[PDB]
Amino acid sequence: EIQDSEVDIVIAALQPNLTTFFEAWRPFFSRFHIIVVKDPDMAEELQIPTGFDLKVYTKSDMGVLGATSIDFSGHSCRYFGYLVSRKKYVISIDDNCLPAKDNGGLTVDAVAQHMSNLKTPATPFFFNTLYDPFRKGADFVRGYPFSLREGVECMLSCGLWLHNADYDPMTHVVKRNQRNTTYVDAVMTVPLGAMMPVSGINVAFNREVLGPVMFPALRLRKEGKHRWDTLEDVWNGLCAKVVCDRLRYGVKTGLPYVMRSDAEAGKALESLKEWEGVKVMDVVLPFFESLKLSSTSVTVEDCVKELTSIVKEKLGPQNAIFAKAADAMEEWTKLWKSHGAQSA
Amino acid sequence: EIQDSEVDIVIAALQPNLTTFFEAWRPFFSRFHIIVVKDPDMAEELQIPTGFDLKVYTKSDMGVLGATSIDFSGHSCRYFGYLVSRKKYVISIDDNCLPAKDNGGLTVDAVAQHMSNLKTPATPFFFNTLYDPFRKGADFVRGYPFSLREGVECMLSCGLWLHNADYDPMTHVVKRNQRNTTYVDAVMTVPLGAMMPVSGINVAFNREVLGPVMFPALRLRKEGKHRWDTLEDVWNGLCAKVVCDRLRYGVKTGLPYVMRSDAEAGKALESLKEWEGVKVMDVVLPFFESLKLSSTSVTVEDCVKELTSIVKEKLGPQNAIFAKAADAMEEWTKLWKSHGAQSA
């Protein structure tokens, strides 16, 4: 259950000029606290039209700890905002996304839909064929058992994207001019145990619960500024999902849509040439099918504690990015106990 | 891959006058073979228009089966059509449904959509957040592992319903004039292991594979003439779903929609007054939550055999309907070996 004052708009600034971004999102963002973060690599500064509650940050400020095994450049910088926040919930999208068009031509307040997704229970144990049983017009289908009608609280809500959808760069280059135009009016609970790709590009979550597992790790290389270049968010998703399923907590996907503006010419190919991600996911898959956890862990941190070991021993010797990521998971576990932990 | 020549439209008639129904479905049924079945409890005569490839069946034909422990009255009569059909795929709709209109105002050829759902592989091992990745405009989301792009065969397609949605009679009486108006333009594979309520109202499946398990069992009351009164289909749903998961076959839900014509005034209360389904589902759920079939089972015949026993063993003594359902589950297993089988 939610009131507005517990929301932090956490934004990655990878484009410095955010006039178009904020002026379009303004009616929906304005009433909230906004933690913009400057990309450490940025050879320019954030040209933001103001009138918002902005608590901007930059690379120097992070030095309050060295974080010796983590790189916060690029997309990873957005995780700093999760650490220097003191709010219960994080609503997070990237600077290249704009407010969407509904089927009715209505402008989709994704921020109000994210808040709705979380306060509203989730149904991971049984698939309601009408989807969200609490949305208007939807309800519980005949055969949905009654003991389950009051779902577990939703800890993570990941939305969708029109236009330049979150395809891998290979799929993007080859398909040429495929753009997403199918507005699917649906939000649904991802069933228990079911794996999913959590797009970092449009997501909101309980900072206080899942902040420990949202660790910036398994970035493929230092360079790269399009979501193509990394798999760290899809990786966080798998971790967070097995955490939620072990705890009988809920996850939702679907609405809201944001409209993701298109890429500069050919960068898809430029990033394609160096995207090892094909091989990565097909080894990471058997690992998470092979992640049936021992019974002891019942705190979020315990599941993290248990997981870093099972990652380090099983995946560690397979590739540098994995060991270097498990070490980043432990360093992030410290960072949460140290700088993320509650006080406000 | 499917052609029209392999589809048998098997329909239960509980309404005697099917002129309004068939003339509306004509553009879509005409090109197919239609196996109407008259409800044994039905005295009057079937007013069906001409111009179809119809082989009506009747109480007379049902008794030559000599079914010792199967009751074919009401919705259950539709299971006779699955036994005496000799085609690969059975598309089955209830007489109270009419073809739906999409957001573009188009009338949904649900028969062509079910076939599309089946010709198309399924993605049960990993949740593609754009839903069916082979539908146009949809595709595989970044991070979806590549070995899983080759989907397993889709053996079951469950469609949805506008207007008088498949709410249980309790939800129907209490929520009053709630009607479904949300056309969710998306079809999706139900992840592995996730239980679901499969509505009998608008569904299609591979007869030769899943036909043994689409069995008449779990009659809760003597005659449930509205889908409210019955759970025989929901029982099929859970059973076949565990089969599909053991055999690594896929199940899809969503498109197509039918416009489910509304109910007789107040009949909802007539059926709720006796709808014990509240408790039934609360016992059937944990059974399937605790139900893992042996890895030894590799054919459908193995899985039905193993499951009917586990039903006989665990659920049988919990209520007469379960043992009586295991008895009918077993009787159908013979009837398939004796009467139904074809090329699997």
Side-chain angles (χ1 to χ4, degrees):
Chain A
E1 177 60 6
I2 309 171
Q3 295 173 347
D4 300 50
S5 63
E6 338 183 33
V7 167
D8 262 0
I9 295 179
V10 186
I11 289 178
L14 308 151
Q15 167 158 316
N17 187 294
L18 302 180
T19 196
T20 44
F21 171 83
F22 273 110
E23 290 300 351
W25 277 109
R26 175 185 293 280
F28 315 117
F29 283 172
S30 55
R31 71 196 207 256
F32 295 105
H33 181 262
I34 315 189
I35 296 181
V36 174
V37 182
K38 160 164 170 157
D39 178 9
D41 299 348
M42 190 174 300
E44 303 88 355
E45 73 158 20
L46 307 185
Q47 296 148 34
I48 299 154
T50 59
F52 301 82
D53 179 12
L54 292 145
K55 189 65 171 69
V56 184
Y57 284 104
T58 177
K59 51 178 159 192
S60 314
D61 312 340
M62 297 192 64
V64 294
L65 280 182
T68 63
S69 303
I70 304 185
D71 179 2
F72 279 85
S73 62
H75 303 294
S76 312
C77 81
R78 215 177 69 177
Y79 292 78
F80 187 61
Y82 309 161
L83 196 68
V84 303
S85 174
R86 302 287 190 91
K87 293 271 192 75
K88 190 180 281 292
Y89 309 98
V90 161
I91 296 177
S92 198
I93 77 174
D94 289 337
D95 51 14
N96 49 96
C97 288
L98 280 61
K101 282 179 165 66
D102 185 83
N103 288 308
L106 316 179
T107 314
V108 186
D109 184 346
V111 197
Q113 184 72 52
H114 277 303
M115 292 175 72
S116 302
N117 287 1
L118 291 161
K119 63 166 66 198
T120 306
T123 65
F125 311 114
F126 207 85
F127 192 107
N128 194 61
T129 43
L130 285 171
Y131 320 128
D132 196 24
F134 310 76
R135 190 168 56 128
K136 264 260 284 291
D139 215 326
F140 287 96
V141 169
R142 178 181 58 94
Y144 200 104
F146 268 74
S147 51
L148 269 47
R149 289 173 86 107
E150 301 182 49
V152 297
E153 190 166 42
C154 180
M155 296 289 100
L156 186 147
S157 168
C158 40
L160 292 177
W161 358 261
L162 272 47
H163 203 67
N164 186 288
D166 203 14
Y167 310 132
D168 58 67
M170 196 160 70
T171 303
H172 193 283
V173 165
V174 169
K175 298 294 184 74
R176 266 148 272 195
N177 205 36
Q178 186 169 261
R179 306 291 192 272
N180 182 14
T181 68
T182 53
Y183 187 102
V184 190
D185 190 328
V187 65
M188 80 194 65
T189 310
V190 174
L192 204 75
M195 291 174 284
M196 71 185 297
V198 174
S199 63
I201 299 162
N202 173 21
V203 61
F205 60 97
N206 180 336
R207 189 201 83 91
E208 144 196 309
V209 171
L210 294 178
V213 59
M214 300 293 293
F215 18 68
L218 192 48
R219 69 186 287 155
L220 305 182
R221 67 197 201 279
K222 172 154 175 46
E223 329 86 70
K225 300 295 178 182
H226 302 93
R227 283 274 171 197
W228 303 323
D229 294 298
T230 195
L231 293 164
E232 65 204 87
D233 49 6
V234 170
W235 164 260
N236 298 168
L238 296 165
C239 299
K241 177 57 179 154
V242 175
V243 166
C244 292
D245 289 342
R246 168 64 164 245
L247 290 26
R248 276 202 159 196
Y249 301 168
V251 184
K252 291 185 176 200
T253 183
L255 290 168
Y257 289 97
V258 297
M259 182 281 288
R260 175 161 142 186
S261 61
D262 218 341
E264 295 172 322
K267 273 68 180 75
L269 176 52
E270 287 178 0
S271 48
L272 173 58
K273 280 180 301 78
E274 197 183 350
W275 176 74
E276 188 77 336
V278 181
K279 293 155 71 177
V280 172
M281 297 310 303
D282 285 64
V283 64
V284 165
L285 161 69
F287 168 81
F288 278 104
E289 194 175 357
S290 63
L291 188 68
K292 287 191 295 183
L293 297 177
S294 178
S295 187
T296 53
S297 296
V298 296
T299 318
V300 172
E301 72 159 72
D302 303 331
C303 292
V304 176
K305 187 69 75 170
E306 182 169 351
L307 182 54
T308 85
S309 183
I310 298 175
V311 169
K312 181 129 60 173
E313 186 179 6
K314 293 174 76 171
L315 285 180
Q318 301 200 28
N319 192 307
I321 68 182
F322 299 136
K324 182 258 158 288
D327 303 340
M329 287 164 60
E330 287 160 14
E331 169 168 351
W332 180 262
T333 307
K334 298 178 195 172
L335 284 160
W336 203 255
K337 291 171 184 292
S338 183
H339 273 76
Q342 180 174 342
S343 298
Chain B
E1 176 61 5
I2 307 172
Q3 302 173 351
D4 299 49
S5 62
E6 340 181 28
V7 170
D8 234 357
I9 303 183
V10 177
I11 290 178
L14 310 193
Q15 301 208 352
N17 187 293
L18 302 181
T19 301
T20 318
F21 170 84
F22 271 106
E23 290 299 351
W25 279 107
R26 177 182 293 281
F28 317 121
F29 289 169
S30 54
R31 65 194 203 253
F32 298 101
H33 185 264
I34 311 190
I35 299 177
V36 174
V37 182
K38 162 168 169 159
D39 179 10
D41 296 347
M42 189 173 122
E44 305 87 358
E45 72 160 23
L46 289 177
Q47 285 143 30
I48 298 155
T50 62
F52 299 114
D53 183 13
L54 285 151
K55 185 71 204 75
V56 179
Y57 286 88
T58 171
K59 180 149 193 170
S60 316
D61 307 272
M62 307 198 73
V64 295
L65 208 73
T68 63
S69 301
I70 299 186
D71 180 1
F72 285 119
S73 62
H75 299 294
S76 312
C77 81
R78 216 173 71 180
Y79 293 117
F80 190 62
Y82 308 162
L83 188 65
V84 305
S85 175
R86 295 320 205 98
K87 289 193 179 294
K88 182 63 63 172
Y89 306 95
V90 168
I91 298 177
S92 200
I93 299 178
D94 283 336
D95 49 14
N96 44 94
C97 289
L98 295 179
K101 280 182 165 66
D102 93 303
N103 290 307
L106 318 177
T107 37
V108 187
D109 183 347
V111 195
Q113 181 72 52
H114 282 305
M115 292 173 71
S116 300
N117 287 0
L118 290 154
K119 66 175 72 190
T120 305
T123 65
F125 312 121
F126 207 89
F127 192 111
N128 195 61
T129 45
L130 281 167
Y131 318 128
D132 199 23
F134 308 97
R135 189 163 111 275
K136 211 194 100 143
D139 213 325
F140 289 96
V141 171
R142 176 181 57 94
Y144 191 104
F146 274 71
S147 52
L148 267 45
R149 294 174 92 109
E150 302 180 49
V152 296
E153 188 168 328
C154 179
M155 299 292 187
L156 183 60
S157 168
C158 336
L160 296 181
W161 352 265
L162 295 185
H163 203 64
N164 187 292
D166 204 12
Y167 307 134
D168 62 68
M170 195 153 67
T171 304
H172 194 281
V173 164
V174 168
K175 295 295 188 77
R176 284 166 277 195
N177 232 288
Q178 183 168 262
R179 301 289 185 269
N180 183 16
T181 180
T182 316
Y183 187 97
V184 187
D185 190 328
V187 38
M188 80 192 65
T189 309
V190 174
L192 201 77
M195 293 173 285
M196 71 183 298
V198 180
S199 64
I201 294 160
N202 170 22
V203 65
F205 64 96
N206 181 336
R207 191 199 84 94
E208 304 310 340
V209 166
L210 294 177
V213 55
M214 299 299 297
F215 36 38
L218 194 49
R219 183 173 295 271
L220 300 183
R221 123 193 201 155
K222 208 314 293 159
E223 57 161 11
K225 286 290 189 283
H226 307 110
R227 284 280 169 196
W228 297 320
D229 291 296
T230 198
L231 293 169
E232 65 203 87
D233 50 6
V234 174
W235 176 261
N236 300 171
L238 297 171
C239 299
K241 178 57 179 154
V242 178
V243 170
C244 292
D245 288 342
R246 178 68 280 182
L247 298 179
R248 281 200 332 128
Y249 296 160
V251 184
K252 295 178 82 156
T253 182
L255 294 165
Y257 289 83
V258 296
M259 184 284 192
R260 185 156 160 260
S261 61
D262 218 340
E264 300 168 56
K267 266 58 179 71
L269 179 54
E270 288 181 4
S271 47
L272 180 62
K273 277 180 172 178
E274 197 204 351
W275 180 72
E276 197 80 339
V278 184
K279 288 175 71 175
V280 174
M281 297 312 305
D282 286 63
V283 60
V284 167
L285 159 68
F287 172 85
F288 280 97
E289 196 171 0
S290 65
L291 184 70
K292 298 193 301 181
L293 296 181
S294 176
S295 302
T296 55
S297 298
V298 299
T299 68
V300 174
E301 180 180 2
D302 303 330
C303 292
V304 175
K305 182 51 70 171
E306 180 170 351
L307 182 53
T308 76
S309 67
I310 300 175
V311 172
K312 178 162 62 171
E313 174 184 288
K314 292 172 73 172
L315 284 175
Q318 301 200 27
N319 192 307
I321 70 181
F322 292 131
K324 180 167 55 184
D327 303 339
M329 288 165 61
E330 284 171 15
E331 177 172 357
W332 191 261
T333 308
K334 280 191 183 176
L335 287 163
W336 206 257
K337 299 177 190 299
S338 186
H339 278 110
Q342 176 170 331
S343 296

